[PDB]
Amino acid sequence: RTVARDITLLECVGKGRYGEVWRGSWQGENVAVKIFSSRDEKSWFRETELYNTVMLRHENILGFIASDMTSRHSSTQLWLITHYHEMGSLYDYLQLTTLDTVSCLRIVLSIASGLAHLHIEIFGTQGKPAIAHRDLKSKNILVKKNGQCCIADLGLAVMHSNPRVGTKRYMAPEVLDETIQVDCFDSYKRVDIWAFGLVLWEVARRMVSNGIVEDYKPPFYDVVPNDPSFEDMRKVVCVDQQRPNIPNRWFSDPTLTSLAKLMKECWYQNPSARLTALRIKKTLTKID
Ligand SMILES: COc1cc(-c2cncc(-c3ccc(N4CCNCC4)cc3)c2C)cc(OC)c1OC
Ligand SMILES: COc1cc(-c2cncc(-c3ccc(N4CCNCC4)cc3)c2C)cc(OC)c1OC
Ligand SMILES: COc1cc(-c2cncc(-c3ccc(N4CCNCC4)cc3)c2C)cc(OC)c1OC
Ligand SMILES: [N+]
Fold this sequence. Notes:
- By secondary structure, the chain is of the alpha+beta class.
- The chain folds into two domains: 1-86, Phosphorylase Kinase, domain 1; 87-288, Transferase(Phosphotransferase), domain 1 (Orthogonal Bundle).
- Helix content is 33%, strand content 18%.
- It has helices at 41-53, 90-96, 101-119, 173-176, 185-204, 230-239, 254-266, 277-286, and strands at 8-16, 19-26, 29-36, 64-71, 76-82, 130-132, 141-143, 149-151, 158-160.
- Helix 3 runs antiparallel to helix 5 (185-204).
- The protein starts with 7 loop residues before the first strand and ends with a helix.
- The chain binds the ligand COc1cc(-c2cncc(-c3ccc(N4CCNCC4)cc3)c2C)cc(OC)c1OC (3 copies) and ammonium ion (NH4).
- It is a single-pass type I membrane protein.
- Belongs to the protein kinase superfamily. TKL Ser/Thr protein kinase family. TGFB receptor subfamily.
- Keywords: ATP-binding, Disease variant, Glycoprotein, Kinase, Magnesium, Manganese, Membrane, Metal-binding, Nucleotide-binding, Phosphoprotein, Receptor, Serine/threonine-protein kinase, Signal, Transferase, Transmembrane, Transmembrane helix.
- Residues 1-288 are cytoplasmic.
- One of its GO terms (cellular component) is plasma membrane.
C-alpha cells in the first residue's frame, strides 16, 4: 500500500525561539506543523515520549496526528503534526473580540475540562497517567469554531503513575522562590492551577458587563516589563505578594463576581490551599 506522507506547508502562523508553526495540508485536510528549532529539541522528545505512553484524546486537548524525525545532511529535522484551529490562540483571539457571558463561561470551562483531564489518573486499560502541563498560558490555548478551547504544547509536561522552566510571567510563587516540592507530583498540578487562574483573569477582563470591558492585557502588565526577568517576577509575586487587580465593575455582574472568587482561590501563596481542576469545573458549571 501507499503511505502518503507529503504535507504541503501553506502559511507560517507562528515563529519563535521554539521554531515555527505552519498551516499545512495532508490529503486535503488542514493540519498544523510545528517545526522545532535545535534549541527546543527536548520539547519534541518530551511530547513524543508522552504520546507514545498515552494517546490522549480529548475535545479540549490539541489533537495529535504525528511526530516525525527526518535525517538531514548534518542535522535532524523534527516536526509535530496536530489538528489545525483556524481561529488561532486565545491570546490572539482576546485581542480582537469581546465576550458575552455564555462565551466567557464556555471558554473557561473548556480550559478547566482539558486541564482536569490532564491532571487525573485513570486506571484500567483505556486509562492514562496523571499529567501536569507546566507551561499553561493564553498562547498555549487554541480557540475552536464551536466556542470551546483546547490546550496545546506538552513539551514541558510531566507524567505520574537540563531541567527546564515555564514562562516566567505565569510562574507560581513556589517556582520563583524555589520552595516547590519537586518530589511531589501534586506540586506540578498546583503550578498549573496558578497559571489557570491568570488565564481566567485574562479572559474575564474581555467579558462585557453594563457596557464596560477592559482592554486585553497579559497578567502583571502593570507591574513588570515585557520579557520580565525571574527577579522581576519574584519581587512581584513572592516578596510583595501582588495579584492581578479585580476591577470594581466586575462586582456589579454576578458572573464576574463568581469568577473573581474563583481566581482568588487559584492564587493562594500556599499551593495546597488552591482549588483542584475538578473543583474548578464544578464551580464553573454552577455559575449562571
Ligand atoms: C510514516 O509516516 C507517516 C504516515 C502516515 C500514514 C499515511 N497513510 C497511511 C497510514 C497508515 C495508518 C495505519 C495503517 N495500518 C493500521 C493497522 N492495520 C494495518 C494498517 C497503515 C497506514 C499512515 C500512518 C501519515 C503521515 O503524516 C500525516 C506520516 O508522517 C508523519
Ligand atoms: C495519522 O493520521 C491519520 C491517519 C489516517 C489513516 C490512514 N490509513 C489508515 C488508517 C487506519 C486504518 C485502520 C486502522 N485499524 C486499527 C486496528 N484495528 C483495525 C483498524 C488504523 C488506522 C488511518 C487512521 C487517516 C487520517 O485522517 C483521515 C489521519 O489524520 C490526519
Ligand atoms: C501553541 O502550540 C501549538 C499551536 C498550534 C496551532 C494549531 N492550530 C492553529 C494555530 C494558529 C493558527 C493561526 C494563528 N494566527 C496568529 C495571528 N495571525 C494570524 C494567524 C495562531 C495560531 C496554532 C499555532 C500547533 C502546534 O503544534 C503543531 C502547537 O504546538 C504544540
Ligand atoms: N524538564
